């Protein structure tokens, strides 16, 4: 149970005093957001609507020093809802019509 309590303390410390409004290194150098795509399907390429439906595992990684922990030697994969509490890139697809 030591690891569970330590991880809870670490995540609570990370999320406490965190400002979602400011990007990493705000007022500083730009944050490098690397991107990775794993296309799972291209459902249909329609000429009538001049569009194609594409399904993918759109992944992106970036460095945020506010979310840096070193007490535990493992990678913490959290609930998806924590994404609503962390800054994420405002990525958008200029082509998408309905997504």
């Amino acid at each position: 149970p030591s690891n569970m309590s330590l991880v809870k303390e670490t995540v609570d410390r990370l999320l406490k005093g965190y400002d979602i409004r400011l990007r990493p290194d705000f007022g500083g150098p730009p944050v490098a957001v690397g991107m990775n795509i794993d296309i799972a399907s291209i459902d249909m390429v329609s000429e009538v609507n001049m569009d194609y439906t594409l399904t993918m595992y759109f992944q992106q990684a970036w460095r945020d020093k506010r979310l840096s922990y070193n007490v535990i030697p493992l990678n913490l994969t959290l609930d998806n809802r924590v994404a609503d509490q962390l800054w994420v890139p405002d990525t958008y697809f200029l082509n998408d019509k309905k997504s």
């Binding site: 400002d19 409004r21 400011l22 290194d25 705000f26 007022g27 500083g28 506010r66």
Partner: peptide, 16 residues
Amino acid sequence: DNTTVFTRILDRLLDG
């Protein structure tokens, strides 16, 4: 600490 200044700026803006 570096981002705390802009956090205080935003908090002052939205205050009241």
